Symmetry: C2
């Protein structure tokens, strides 16, 4: 009945099914539970010389259900260690889930502020529920004590969730996402002197598209001379190359100071153009980088790992910097280089109407592929990742010279979902693809961080290699760097 006993029960279920988890799709250097289901990352913080990541977690099976907070820690944002579960549903205010939230340092006390979820009437997607903001503390970083409800919404407001709290002007601010009376998604800003008593300040942001019914997972933070709002809109219609995923994740750049509206200088932009990127949260690193982690997955997608008694992976952590035109340059954190093994460097690889097996293991590896766009005039030219030795199965990452786009096509990748995602080719003589392959994922960083593509893949081949290919013309690879990537856990 006590949360201490509910956490012990939950930890025992995770430990029980951990032995049934197959390696084929389990990430070597991304965050996953030992077994069972995870989704959105929560409570990101650098606290007492360590990086903490929590996540939405169903401990009892590989599907979504009674949500707990899972927990990992690292010294270096890379060597993530599994910890015991932090929060289990245990009170009227959180009976049906400890939903998303953040962490803060309250005068040396690690403090979690999360949405408590309770179902009031079960009608599937027509369900009525109660969402309020709740607070928990820890003296040791491992065991947490609930301190109860701290923010209740207005009457008629139901969707009211995903608090992100920060200190400013010896005061605290909170952003939450809300579905308003007129059925529009908004981010609301609240403030507090004590973390227990909160007052509404303003509607921080809404979107012009009236079909956006929710803004999940708001994070509002300074970056250079601007403020950035990252969030996850629901209800944006897929439009050409835009908003292809079931739900969106992206960013708004503007100007704000306490007492002012958030005046938008750059409208909503997707954070990642791939298939599997949802529910970003950020933290400030020790050296004051702005770091984003997201769920490397998408609601309603086929999840082949569920056959193996686990599901859910987080993205690599990525740095956020403003370009001079106030777009986010997004790059892998430098600490990932610590996982690098055997380096292989190939220079000046030409192909014309041909394929080439590079004979490089594609289970867990990092590539830097520099392509000469002027002289790579093939209709389709690039790399086949995580490929069967017969080349029948692969994840295609290539220049389409007709579309003038980079294509990530998982149609022939293995189990689960088909089709492609894409970005516009950058205005540059050279295209650099910085590619991280794990057992069930591809992350691509384009050029200096101008764009990223993140997709899950589920290869079925016993051995995984890489091919280069050029169809109907030439590929010019100026340089290919390859590293094997070590398991982060040892």
């Amino acid at each position: 009945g006590s949360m201490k006993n509910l956490i012990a029960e939950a930890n025992q279920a995770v430990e029980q099914f951990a032995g049934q988890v197959k390696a084929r799709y389990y990430p070597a250097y991304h965050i996953a539970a030992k077994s069972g289901w995870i989704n959105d990352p929560n409570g990101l913080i650098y606290f007492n010389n360590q990086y903490h990541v929590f996540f939405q977690h169903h401990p009892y099976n590989e599907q979504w259900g009674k949500i707990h907070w899972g927990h990992v820690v690292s010294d270096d944002l890379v060597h993530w260690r599994n910890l015991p579960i932090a929060l289990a549903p245990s009170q009227e205010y959180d009976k049906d889930g400890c939903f998303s939230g953040c962490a803060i340092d309250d005068n040396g006390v690690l403090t979690l502020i999360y949405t408590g979820h309770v179902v009031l009437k079960e009608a599937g997607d027509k369900s009525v529920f109660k969402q309020v903001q709740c607070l928990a503390t820890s003296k040791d970083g491992i065991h947490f004590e609930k301190q109860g409800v701290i923010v209740t919404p207005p009457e008629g407001i139901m969707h009211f969730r995903d608090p992100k709290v920060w200190r400013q002007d010896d005061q605290w601010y909170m952003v939450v996402g809300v579905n308003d009376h007129d059925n529009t998604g908004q981010v609301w800003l609240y403030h507090s002197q004590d973390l227990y008593h909160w007052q509404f300040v303003q509607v921080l942001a809404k979107m012009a598209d009236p079909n956006v019914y929710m803004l999940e997972c708001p994070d509002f933070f300074p970056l250079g001379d601007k403020y950035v709002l990252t969030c996850s809109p629901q209800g944006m219609k897929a439009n050409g190359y835009h908003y292809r995923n079931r739900y969106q994740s992206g960013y708004i750049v503007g100007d704000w100071q306490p007492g002012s509206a958030f005046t938008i200088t750059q409208d909503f932009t997707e954070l990642d153009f791939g298939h599997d990127y949802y529910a970003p949260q950020t933290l400030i690193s020790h050296d004051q980088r702005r770091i984003v982690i997201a769920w490397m997955d998408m609601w309603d997608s086929v999840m082949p790992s569920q056959a193996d008694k686990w599901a859910g992976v987080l993205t690599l952590p990525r740095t956020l910097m403003l370009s001079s035109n106030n777009k986010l340059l997004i790059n892998p954190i430098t600490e990932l280089k610590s996982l690098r093994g055997i380096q292989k460097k190939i220079t000046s690889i030409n192909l014309s109407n041909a394929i080439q097996d590079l004979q490089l293991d594609s289970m867990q590896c990092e590539l830097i592929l520099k392509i000469d766009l002027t002289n790579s005039d093939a209709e389709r030219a690039g790399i086949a990742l995580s490929a069967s030795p017969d080349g029948k199965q692969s994840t295609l990452l290539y220049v389409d010279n007709q579309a003038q786009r980079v294509i990530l096509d998982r149609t022939y990748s293995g189990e689960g979902m088909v089709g492609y995602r894409s970005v516009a080719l950058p205005a540059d003589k050279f295209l650099t693809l910085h590619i991280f392959i794990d057992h069930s994922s591809v992350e691509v960083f384009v050029n200096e961080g101008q764009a990223t593509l993140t997709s899950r893949i589920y290869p079925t081949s016993e051995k995984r290699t890489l091919f280069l290919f050029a169809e109907n013309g030439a590929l010019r690879v100026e340089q290919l760097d390859y590293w094997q990537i070590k398991n982060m856990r040892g």
Copy 2:
């Protein structure tokens, strides 16, 4: 030595290898030689109650070589009958080929005006040759008599070819394509009172792109209140979705009258957005339609039919009409309906994340597929043409809702070339695809004739079916009409 004996020898070679031609790729209702190689259509004319089409023809094997004029006839632009060869190289002025040309009615005498080609020095692509315009006559429509050279170029002009001649103001005009002293492609206009003595009138057209070194196969004709120039530029760089084929075919719309420049109102536009469309020529039908036929092929493409001792197919004949914004609406001639057999009508077919075998023979058939674009929101949704029963092999014709384009992808079609061609989705609630499938070809007419896609395919399956497919969303087919198409020859 005599052309009469050279034609007999050439006809005997065609007859000799005709028995070795396999059905698998041989067109049931498009023009081909009985055996051997054909390319550009020549001498299109309605003469003495019959439609004549000639074509560049190598009778002795399935590769390009000593060029003859092949010849077919029809009463109805559809039931084409093979005739004996019309012209064989036989003189100093045409020793290495009777290259392209036209036909006119010279006061009841069917008259051919063609380029005579002779190699002066063999250096591959560095070869020096002589091209002059020559004339031949016929009293019977079958046997032709050479009357010698009628137009010689200026000194230093080598590429000088593909005459198209028409009567206007009791005078004759000729257009030829030329490579000028500065290495630019031009169309030159000449005139004559007698068909034997020609005078240069003007440079009719040149293109702004200085890399265009040749304009092959010019045809200059009135359409409504405009003049249209169809031609085949060489040297246009492939640019995004534009100019993908090795060489181009397209049209220029403007204003002209004798004594004036051809003032361009619509710049060069491709005639067909597919893989296999080159060297159009036009004729006036009995009822005064403007009809275009082209070579349904492309220089330098893999030609799998060459294993079967023949190569080369002409397109369907198509009508040309000016839209109110002076683009060509291009439609199949109505006489093709005479080939229709068993009709099958399906209404209101929905698919979501699924495939459906329509169990319809795709050897030789006509389809009208009407798609609801508003409700066909799948990432990829359409038809798999000429498909193996296991669906491993097919020609994909579909809506890409990310690109917002119609895609014709022959990557999995069978033997030979891979990759796709495309057109922009029309601004219309509905997309109509009017599709003609023959043993080695697909022709698509979009909506009212706004765009066409023509590609060769080489299926290897013993049985050929059709599938509908929708990936990552819905397909709404409002109506599918199917006809089996009869062999035109009986």
